[model samples]
Target chain A: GSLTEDGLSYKEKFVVRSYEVGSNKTATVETIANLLQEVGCNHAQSVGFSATTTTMRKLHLIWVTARMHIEIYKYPAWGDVVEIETWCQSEGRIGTRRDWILKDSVTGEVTGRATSKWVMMNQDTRRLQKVSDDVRDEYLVFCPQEPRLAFPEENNRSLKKIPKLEDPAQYSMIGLKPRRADLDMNQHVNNVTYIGWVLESIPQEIVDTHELQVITLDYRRECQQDDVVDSLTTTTSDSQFLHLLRLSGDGQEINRGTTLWRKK
Target chain B: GSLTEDGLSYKEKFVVRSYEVGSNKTATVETIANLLQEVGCNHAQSVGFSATTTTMRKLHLIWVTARMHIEIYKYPAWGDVVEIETWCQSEGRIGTRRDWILKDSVTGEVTGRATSKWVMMNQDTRRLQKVSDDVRDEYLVFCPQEPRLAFPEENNRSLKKIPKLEDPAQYSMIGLKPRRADLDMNQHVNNVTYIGWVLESIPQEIVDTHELQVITLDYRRECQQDDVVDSLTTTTSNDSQFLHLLRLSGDGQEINRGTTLWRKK
Candidate 1:
């Protein structure tokens, strides 16, 4: 990734590799999420504000995603080159928001857009914490002066907060375990694995005929390596589905999600 | 990936991405497997001999991996660029062998090496087929006149056939189902997924202290997305050496068997 927008944004170009695509011969939703996460890390490293610092590392502080919203207008297929541009903004007193625009390099069309909220946390205690003034100031210069949203709020309710799914969902898959490959560098289950679990609960017919257009995820807790998860989904309509991922042992919520799909 | 060695060998440069690394901050075994698969496809496509020619596609023919052997001398960490060179050779009347050399581009050090055997099979019938003359001529030009082995045999029995683990194994993981992401374009469970399952039954202490140095896998049957697998392991030594088996849940059919050697990190 290269610094753009006068070092405020980072842009990267990627070819949709054969293994990254699904049976449909297009990049999967998980692939898109992974690319977003990769570019975000690159952006931070480019600014010398990587995940750790002499002070932050001593404090055992790390950034964790608290919420994310993604909208895909089109999916890039195998061998297609996609260009991604991302920028960051300071969120509330304790958080930061990052946004991205994904484009087809050849066609010059925006194929996907996403925004996410992240917060600082103590890695050992796993407790949320407020960002120190020193830390905030270091990265603030790299953020936009005014906040930007990939999916702007409107009278039509674009990218609304995902509501919790009630009890007795229409479909549920129990006893899902995280594979060793699911753990990332932080030794926590990678966020994109959650998307795969959410889709596991959908009916086969829907997965066969439809493509996911929008996904909104609200994370409540970090999933550990040994955690056994259960996924539940309920449909509000043929096109919209609500999902919940919770621990099978104590019923603690790990994440809640909303998905919008369209006919292939 | 680009063709090299006068269009006989293919080479690709890859930066170890942030997410591809494991807890140790180095590329995982599965990542290495994926890279090898990626370059092989690119090589085939470059030669106008991809998995499916119009005639092959009409016959429902596809290539499948029969066996694989890999050895790692060092692992590439995040931001490290790896250069890989791969080429193919005809193994016999019905099979072809592909070999790769992975290097640290900056240091020009060979860090890893691997080889795999593949054969054509009827996708619908799942029956092995002999390569037609037309198909053989299309790709044979790109292969070396003489065969090459990534791990040459010696009195030491390098790359020997993996011995199957007997019943009553010391450690085992059962009811391992394939995730949706585990499927490749052929709708079969990807070969890399088996490596993760093989490691699942290993004791945590070994994984924490040692890095894998060598892995040899023998594929007997294909695993489908819906299949439930049981992975079993038995130590052949104090810790660094072991035998493994992946069996189908109901019939106890062996899907694959393997061996692993590790060294203290």
Candidate 2:
């Protein structure tokens, strides 16, 4: 119902629900992350570029997110309506890219921008796979001829790489388990759930005085329901935090993140 | 925006978002809980019966949930559009009640029903207050002369009371702290968040095989961000589970008590 006529782009409108807001009366970054995922999936399903795609479904393949970057210029308050437009392009031979433009539905002012990279993975083998020509051709017609980046610098590598936080981090929260509600149809912890864990280790001092401005998450592994997670955070500066998530048992990396904050 | 023409009820449509569904590909109970809260607020806002009601807001008064009871006949799958209709009526001298009718937007068949009780609280004093006549007269016009109950049993009291969960419960999970994102505009933990904490102590064996059929929650006290919490669960029968949430402090004050009915998947 939200698909655009062009078939290459999708637009959806959301009324920021009261439950979506934080104590600040504005939508939280976690809400934005969930919106991005919702629109991304809706767009994929509209274009038949989803897990059920002909050849991909036959091959038991599905798309799994690799990395994501989000920058918010403003947060919508409860009762405010925001419209999001998203389009996708082939990232490379194996990966695909999706970008979004978030706007205030009333004033038409840009509020935020986000982009993420996804790759195909075999559901049965649990291994990354190259996009076959059959699968690639099926959805290529729905992509834009010229790729667009929400962040211009994305085309020419702008930011420093997200560094892995080493051992003995300044702050940590251990024994985090996934709630049953946190799982999705994929039977794995939703990526949005990881964002909260990344911040769980952040000190209350920063959480109370600062607000998140930008976040970049590089997911290295998918977390299952039984996994016990540990979140560790180390500061690069007063306003920046580097975070890492790992399995408490074997210390396997689950996700790496960087968050930039500003004074509230 | 979703108010009905007559102004007595509110209706909203929702397409089960992918993230809202569980491994079963149907919307989870938590999603339904959130939708209930959303529609309830929308109905109040539309009728000018919210915390911002003239004198109420001036006195720093807000509505706090007292109890909720929900029953689901079926769970909706992903991409299914479900329509929810809600209405409110005065419960008694000091309380107000809201009820919902959940339907499959396409077939127009009933799928679930829910009801909740709310009372006014002085935000500053943290004490319950009776509904002043001014507040009552202001919004009574929007409510139906004859109140409607989604569940017939609600009219005449039915069902056993949710028993208090005691020490040495069969299952327990401690050290659960409220996430910053979990707080609502009230600056207290959202009622829906309590649902998760209630299930946290549920045995994995039941979680893996059973799906929630009915949930009844009684709010005993409000939980704040700084309050460390513990969840305890005990089984009354094979299909019934009793839950208790408490603040992990010197007082160990009770925050909520709940009962959940589950059916084997």
Candidate 3:
């Protein structure tokens, strides 16, 4: 329902069959990030090079989340064509809000919808800037003006905190430094790098002991090149693990991740 | 010396440090790729992004070739660093070649040197175009001379090809249809996605057989998001494996071959 036949809008359709989900069938934060990046790149390419930000600038663009809410009614299976529709609703003085809808192509079932807020800034100055008039206009033409539906009241809590475990030392930690290669066109660290770092940070012991089921992360702040980050992890008796990633300088929390692990 | 405080010509300096080499203690392709990306990124940032072809095209442009008839005296080791001085040598109708010198940062040793040719193209038409005078003039400010070095003699012999292995029979070959999410600003499949694909494509048998030591790939061609690619793999008795990725249409080769190995835990 999020898609319209307007020439100004952008629509990308993808298949998500039952097989892609494997045995543990659930969507993940990384999967969502990949989806967003795909749509974002499409939106940027629609604008001419002169008006659009360079890849390095895109990498550097900071994604500040004032709020993000996701709800999944039905688990997506492999071989199912899922239509993903994304459009920017509004760009204010501080940041912009974008909405997304994921629907099953065959059944025309709405699988999930999420709303996320992101802010753009001058990487050098770290100050906010207004979205370009060209971009703002194009987005308004594609997105509807109706009020957004509120997320479930029970999911109101921010995803930044992971459930704590009684024993913390049973887990291992990994450290990572954002390198030059990690930064994308926007000049900030690429979102995919965060996922890679989290995956790399998992201890070898945990990997051998369990199979990864579902992973969710609350992206809190933008990580820049040369920033050193530490991934602190703790495991619960239920075999679920919590990962907290923070920058080294001020210990600014970047993202909080949780994963359910089942014995292989 | 590429760095000139008072010289009339423009020059840039680079150091080929020990860390730049591969695990074999030699300059590897991965190191070279990283160097190219870094230098290219830095160059664009220094010049106005709009002025650089790399930024304008939304693609990282490169032409990598080995110098023919040249023999290396010695490869730099750990704790050794090399400085690379680069300058624009000449601009032809089709391309421009930029020359470089690799020097040791510690003892000021000259390790290795080479040149790269870059072709200008219009992003919209995807057609080769003449380098705009504005852009060429900007580059000339950095290097004002036609390089004195001769072009390396072309070698017709192909590099030794790695063997291909069959897919592990126990696990089903996971097939994934490329999506828009797989594409990057280059309008092509991203370099990192290849790594993810390889990891995802790993046969369940291999996962249970051995521990992974390293995974490396040499990108031979550009891959578009719409292209269908089949990953062909081969394994050796020594516990090493080779992967050849090809675009399904007309058997177009995207990468010559990739190699990975596992160590006994």
Candidate 4:
């Protein structure tokens, strides 16, 4: 009944499924992130990156995400269909960059834009890779001339190195434990699940007043089922906040993130 | 891209999302249950039962499911679209019955069929109600003449009255704690999440071999966010397995009769 046809530059429409909506009755930030990744994966799969590669057939691992910048003008509500488009911009020395645009299908309005960088990662052995010339050659055919959404350059801005949460009063903490349902077929807690935790554990007042304008998160470590983590957050500025997901057991950082907000 | 255009029989297509699939690489039974409920709700919303009564809008509560039967011939894989058609089969004195059929959208091949019964519950009062003639008359137009799938009457094998899970050693146990994500918009644990808990709790060996063909779930009690349940299952016969979900707290009460699956490679 639905076709993944190119409408807004190959953008596909995704109906906001019931489970993806949160208490607000709108799509959760984590679900938005998941859709973004899904559309991105669709691009990768269509281009035969791993779809044609027999060895990489079972793998969809992200070696590393250098930076992710998302500016959400709106969030799709439950039972609503939204359009999302993803495309690759350039191939760098070690990795490549991608860009996305979001739109409300019924209203036909631009709702969000995001840009991120990713490198190759392995699943079976679990490590990053700097591919050979031949491997890079396969990806260049899929890369576009330039990015769709304009943001800061890598040198102009970086994923903020979030400060360690020291004082309990400044930061609010919630116990987050990994469950089997959180894990993907790849045997690690999904990035979207991590985002879900951050979105859920964030101070409710801030979440109520502001929509996520720009989010840059770094996937530092893999969290297994054995891990127990704490989501810690503190308002750093009127329009900005610092977020960190750290393991409570060893006191190690699992992921660090920064959220820029605009009052809704 | 999909439409629920018919008043009595509506066919809707759903793409199996990644989050909905399970370890078996198929849409989980819970996911299927969720879709069934969604379609049935669509039928309700289209008819405007809530529009007739202001109080019923917020009271979209499922008092109890007397029994449910589902037979799955094949499970839809992720990225695949499946068509599901549902309609109200009957309006009884106490409750109403609904029927569903799941099929491959592209091939038009039958994949699954199900039948279920539910009663109205009030959200604020938290009780089931059998309203007088007027309320019953309003809901009559939606009921069909007969059930789509043929099943024996009440004389047919019903959801067995599962006995108390007395010994821990006799059955496998998996802890199922409700979370905010487990709750539906109606402020209750979604039945699909309960099915997920049951699927996760069954012994690995049994789950590996048994493909759930026909499922019968009877919602006995509601699981709130505060409650913790243990999914218990024991063999009743060589092919038949008995399953019950009981609370972890004192009294060890039952929640639902989750499923009865058949073996396959």
Best by lDDT: 1
Output the worst ten-in-a-row residue range by lDDT, candidate 2 chain A.
Answer: A153-162
Candidate 4 chain A: 10-residue stretch with minimal lDDT: A1-10
Query: Candidate 1, which segments miss by more than 4 Å at Cα?
Result: A53-55, A155-159, B53-55, B132-134, B155-159
Give me the candidate number with maximum DockQ.
1
Choose 3 or 4, whichever is better by DockQ.
4
Q: Write down the C-alpha DockQ for each prediction.
A: 0.75, 0.69, 0.02, 0.31
Point out the higher-scoring one by DockQ: 2 or 3: 2
- What lDDT does the true structure give each of the candidates? 0.85, 0.83, 0.49, 0.67
DockQ metric, candidate 1: 0.75
* lDDT (tens digit, per residue) of candidate 2 on A172-207: 988887777777786778899999889889897786
Query: Candidate 2 local accuracy as lDDT?
Result: 0.83
CAPRI-style class, candidate 3: incorrect
Which 10-residue window in model 2 chain B sums to the lowest lDDT? B152-161
Best of the two (2, 4) by DockQ: 2
Clashes of 1: 0
Lowest lDDT sum, 10 consecutive residues, model 3 chain A, at: A16-25
For candidate 1, lDDT tens digit of each residue in A77-164?
A: 8889999999998875777888999999998999999988889999888899988877777677788887577777673224466788
Model 3: lDDT to the true structure: 0.49
lDDT of 4 by residue, A1-264 (tens): 222343223467887866667666787677788788777766665655442243334454444565666778788987788998777654556776777778999888988877776777786566887644655565555555445544555653344465655556256455566555666554557677777666555665776677777777777776776676777777777487777788877778887787788887
